[model samples]
Target: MSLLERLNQDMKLYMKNREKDKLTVVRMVKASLQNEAIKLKKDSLTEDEELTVLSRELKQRKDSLQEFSNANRLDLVDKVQKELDILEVYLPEQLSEEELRTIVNETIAEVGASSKADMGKVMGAIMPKVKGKADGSLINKLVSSQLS
Candidate 1:
């Protein structure tokens, strides 16, 4: 079944189980996916597109969690963290720092990137391989360090 179908089924399951928190996260994901489809004027998104949307949502949640924690809003931080956990269930397993480093090195070599000026070339070559597995900012830092 498609990711959308699985999400729809899970939405129903969450409602049936009275999992309010999980239901809220699932509904938000569904709405986001639907909104993307509408904006693109597409009837349906592929699994890759769904993964991209999930990645974007997870990133946003992580940023918000950091902000809330920094502001000492423990209540909001906990709520956002719980939603982040729910979103993470759909994301690919994250790459370890060591693993990411190796990939960055290989990407640099593969793209023949020798300096910070070639950051975009290295990033374009690396992002597809890292998508859903690593954060873009982390990858950028690694690539920059390698080039510099």
Candidate 2:
């Protein structure tokens, strides 16, 4: 089923199961998606789109967690950590370093990218295949490292 449908089912299930704390995070995602759907005049978003939304939420939480760690705000960090844990349940599993490096090398070979000058071309070739599987910044760094 589509992620949108999946979200609705999860929310309903959470409600029935009285999973209040977990459901709170789920509701936040649902609310954001509902708002986006209204703005776009669509009943639901695609799984890819939902994945994009989830990626954004995960990134924001990670950034917040980092900052909170820097500030030594354990309480806020713990709260964000709980939300992050639930958010990860829906996000794609990340590719390991070995997988990422191998993919980057293959793409570089396919694109025949020789040096840093061809970074854009290499990135263009790799990103579509790696989307949701790897982090963009890390992918770029790996590509550059290989090329340079």
Candidate 3:
């Protein structure tokens, strides 16, 4: 099934199981997807678009979780983490550090990127392959090191 269809199914399951917190998170995800579709004037988003939305949501939650933890608000951190857990259900499997390194090396070679100045070229070549499966910051760091 498509990501949206799977989400709808999960929403029904959540409702049936009386999972209030999970249901809330699922509803929020649906709202975000609908909002994006409306903004783009699309009938429905592709699976890639849905994954992008899911990744964005998960990233935002992780950022907020860190901020909350730093501010000594453990309760808010826990709450955000729960939402993150639900969001992760839809995310692609993450790449390992070793796998990411290999990809970065291959991308750098493919792009003929010999220095840090060519970081953009290497990133452009690799990002499409790594999107949603890797963190941007981690990829940037890897590319920088590889190029340097």
Candidate 4:
């Protein structure tokens, strides 16, 4: 089934199960997808577009989680982590660090990326290959260190 269909199915199941957190996240993702479609003047988003918006949601939660950790806000940290977990349910299975490293190495060699200045060139080539399978910040760190 398409992601929208999966969301629709899970939305009902969440309602029946009283899974408040999951239900809220499901609604939020659906809303984000709808907003993107409206912005692009389309009735529905393509699969990649949906994943892009979903990744943004996951990234936002991750950023907040980090900030909460830094400020020692344990209370809010738990809340955001729950939301992050819920959001992660929709993401593709993540790439392992080893797998990601291989891709990064391959892309760097493929693009002839010799230094940090080639970061943009390497990342552009890699993002399309990895997409929702890996986190952008993680890839950034890997590529940053590899180039340096």
lDDT of the candidates, in the order given:
0.88, 0.83, 0.85, 0.89
- Please say which candidate is ahead in TM-score: 1 or 3: 1
Determine which window of 10 residues in candidate 1 has minimal summed lDDT.
46-55
lDDT digits (tens) for residues 68-102 of candidate 3: 99999999999999898777777778788899999
Error of 2 at 88 (Å): 1.5
Candidate 1 lDDT over 1-148, as tens digits, reads: 7777888999999999999999999989989999999999999887767777887888889899999999999999999999988988878887887999999999999888899999989989988888888776677889999996
All candidates in order of TM-score, best leading: 1, 3, 4, 2
Evaluated with TM-score, which candidate comes out highest?
1
Clashing pairs in 2: none
Candidate 3 has an lDDT of 0.85
**Error at 29, model 1, angstroms:** 0.9
Which candidate, 1 or 2, would have the higher TM-score against the true structure? 1
Clashes of each: 0, 0, 0, 0
After the best TM-score superposition of candidate 1, give how far the Cα of residue 21 lies from its true spot, in angstroms: 0.6
TM-score per model over all chains: 0.82, 0.74, 0.78, 0.78
- Scanning candidate 3 in windows of ten residues, the lowest lDDT window is 47-56
- The lDDT leader among the candidates is 4
| TM-score, cand. 2 | 0.74
For candidate 4, lDDT tens digit of each residue in 1-148? Answer: 9888898999999999999989988988888888999999999988877878887888888889899999999998998999988888899877888999999999999999989999999989998888888776788899999996
Question: What's the C-alpha lDDT at position 94 in model 1?
Answer: 77
